[PDB]
Amino acid sequence: PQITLWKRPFVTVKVGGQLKEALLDTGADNTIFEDINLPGRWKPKMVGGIGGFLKVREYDQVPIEIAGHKVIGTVLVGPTPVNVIGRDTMTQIGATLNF
Amino acid sequence: PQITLWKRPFVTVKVGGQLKEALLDTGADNTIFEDINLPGRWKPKMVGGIGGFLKVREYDQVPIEIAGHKVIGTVLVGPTPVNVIGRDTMTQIGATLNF
Ligand SMILES: [Y+2]
Ligand SMILES: [Y+2]
């Protein structure tokens, strides 16, 4: 797809087999979802920095599907105001910024 | 240009005649710089919101240039950890996300 940026670029994503909405966010290094359940082991990861650090769970090699593209990426699971697709997942799907 | 997403997509921009580096950030509604001086009329604007809102100065129709594309946009001036080119400016330059 080619996505213009007059609205927030939210997309439907299937992550670890679950359907969610998430924002295509070129300002975010990492991908993060709240309220999904992923199986297997994870590594704790300290993220954020404002007012303290947030502890989240980092999962490796998680299946992700966006617009028919099935890829694998690192996914953090923890509290987030909205779900974020960061540049880690964007590089897997081959997304570029163009003008 | 076509900008891949393996690193943070910083670009050099000229804003109000002053040369700055800033992040192309499809997760940001607005464009914000710290430590530029803009002339002319501004109004305070409350932005952000998690933890409280941040007060910034909003300037209209500011000249912005990126990779030789001269556009006009709203620019907010106030505290920000990195300067940000948000969706308001990216729609003016015709930037899209593509995969
Ligand atoms: Y929540
Ligand atoms: Y952001």
Side-chain angles (χ1 to χ4, degrees):
Chain A
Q2 172 168 100
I3 296 170
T4 52
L5 288 165
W6 301 98
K7 67 196 291 195
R8 305 178 175 148
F10 283 96
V11 291
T12 303
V13 52
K14 198 190 292 199
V15 53
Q18 300 147 263
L19 288 156
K20 298 294 292 197
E21 288 294 305
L23 176 69
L24 296 175
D25 184 349
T26 62
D29 298 339
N30 307 125
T31 290
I32 181 167
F33 287 87
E34 196 188 307
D35 294 324
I36 61 174
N37 283 305
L38 293 177
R41 76 99 68 184
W42 44 266
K43 292 185 253 98
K45 195 196 174 62
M46 295 313 297
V47 304
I50 293 326
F53 290 88
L54 182 60
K55 190 184 315 184
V56 301
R57 291 183 285 171
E58 181 184 350
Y59 297 78
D60 290 289
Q61 299 199 64
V62 178
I64 301 159
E65 180 168 18
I66 304 171
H69 297 239
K70 294 188 174 179
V71 298
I72 52 178
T74 301
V75 173
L76 307 176
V77 177
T80 182
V82 290
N83 302 138
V84 174
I85 304 307
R87 296 186 291 98
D88 53 357
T89 301
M90 289 186 286
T91 56
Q92 293 312 126
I93 71 191
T96 55
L97 280 161
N98 297 266
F99 58 106
Chain B
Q2 173 167 295
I3 297 175
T4 54
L5 290 171
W6 308 98
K7 48 181 72 153
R8 300 184 182 167
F10 282 97
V11 295
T12 303
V13 58
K14 199 175 202 188
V15 61
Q18 299 145 84
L19 276 185
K20 303 294 270 188
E21 293 300 299
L23 181 72
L24 293 172
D25 185 348
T26 56
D29 298 338
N30 306 127
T31 291
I32 182 172
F33 288 82
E34 177 176 270
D35 198 53
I36 63 176
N37 293 294
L38 291 174
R41 218 139 89 273
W42 53 269
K43 58 204 153 185
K45 179 185 181 66
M46 299 309 302
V47 300
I50 285 141
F53 280 87
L54 175 63
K55 198 170 160 164
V56 301
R57 292 180 284 171
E58 175 177 15
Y59 295 79
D60 298 341
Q61 276 193 260
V62 170
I64 298 163
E65 185 182 357
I66 303 174
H69 292 253
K70 287 194 197 178
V71 305
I72 61 177
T74 302
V75 166
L76 305 182
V77 181
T80 180
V82 300
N83 295 323
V84 166
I85 299 310
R87 294 187 297 96
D88 57 348
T89 301
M90 286 181 281
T91 55
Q92 298 300 307
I93 66 190
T96 51
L97 278 170
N98 292 270
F99 62 105

